[PDB]
Amino acid sequence: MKASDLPLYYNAVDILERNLPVRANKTALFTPDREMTFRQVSNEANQVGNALKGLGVRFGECVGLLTLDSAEWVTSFFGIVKLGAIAVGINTLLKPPEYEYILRDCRARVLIVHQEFLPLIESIRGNLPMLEHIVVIGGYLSFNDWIRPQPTTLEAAQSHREDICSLNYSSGTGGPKGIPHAHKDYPLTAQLWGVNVLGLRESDRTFALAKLFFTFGTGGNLIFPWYVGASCVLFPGAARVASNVLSTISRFKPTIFYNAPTGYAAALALKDFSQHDLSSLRLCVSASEALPAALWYAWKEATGVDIIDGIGCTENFHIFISNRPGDIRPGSSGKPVEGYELKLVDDEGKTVPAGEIGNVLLRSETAALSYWHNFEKSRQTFQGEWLATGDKYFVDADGYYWHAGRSDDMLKVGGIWVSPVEVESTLIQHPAVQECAVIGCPDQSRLIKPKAFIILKPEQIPSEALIRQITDHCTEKMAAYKRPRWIEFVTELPKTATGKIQRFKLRSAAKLAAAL
């Protein structure tokens, strides 16, 4: 669909309210502590919207939302959006200085926070002159007491479809950049990918390990399913415990499962993976980083369920290149999504020849107009009708897009560019490797060479044979210049809360260690 198909004045609360009153009694969200129907969610959201008015919240103002994946997260979100205020979904695993930057940068007058993050804000309270009211979920306004006297009716704000309704802070190399999205972006992404590509329907039930502050989870596990009347499952617990994730799948029986390759690998690493009932699943989705072909087969062979890998970014809200239930090429990002126009260019802007590595330029109506409080980086990223994602890609002879890696993660060995994704995808083929990361590192002649940081399967330790096996595997599958000069075994890798690997930290630690 197009933006022109939408009414000129649109509010993203319609994502929820397009289901009323027909699906008023259908359970909309499933949480271990709570289950709500579409009517109950709408009622509580209207109470939130009314309660925010009592705190003086107005159209165009940012409201802080820092809590676990829960019913209170959703009702707060739609309460803010319906009011015409700007919802700020904040990362749950940050530091107090990181929270201080965010809240000051968006001038949040009101913060909705869970009690377990309360002291993390309490120590930065003085440095937030605009923050007046802190509502606590779990000296302050408690969530339930705060929405109790408020009526369950509310009129949606007369928001333009291009007006900002949300602000997502994407972690940088930094710090984080504020990414504002308009009301129009929500039904657009829900239609362009959620329906047209993934094939979400009313009978479906979504469950994403990705959190609601991550737009991968925001769309896939809330905006997209509710757009078609489907239900969603919210997991408030720590994502690191893969066993509890599989049990949630067994208990609540979702039909769609979202995760990152690092999450799929962690699940398959479990010795008792098959002991969980995953039969309700009809489709799985992977994103955040490129899903290795070895992981796609390992999951397909253990579950029978296809995984849909697709690349998205917070600047575009969601996926712009994806695979399809009828068309999957394991290891690739699939085909261009209809409505999104792609382009691969060199480092000077010229369209590369077919098959060669180029920079990704995205043409989208769901893309943000600019960053929040980053003038320089906005003009570097948002190039008119084209969006620079900072990714290197190349196209198959069959038209399939393969992620070479982040432009920063690319390493140059002997003048030739080496893709970390390809090398990592080869390493993970070995059954002893759970996951890995490949960076560039000077070789005491200061010639950059590939170094592989490898996490082994649980309880497995390196051996003289294992190194040899991995070495011989890289000789058979990759060209000599792409082979890892060093192989270092680790028990953990620097990760973001969005299921990414912070290779810039490995690149920092390796450069530091090389100088010793």
Ligand SMILES: Nc1ccccc1C(=O)OP(=O)(O)OC[C@H]1O[C@@H](n2cnc3c(N)ncnc32)[C@H](O)[C@@H]1O
């Ligand atoms: N916001 C999202 C919504 C939906 C799906 C992902 C996201 C998302 O992660 O948004 P972010 O702002 O955190 O970062 C985007 C960057 O992550 C990388 N990436 C994401 N998905 C893939 C993939 N399937 N294959 C290869 N690389 C991928 C890519 O470099 C991109 O530039």
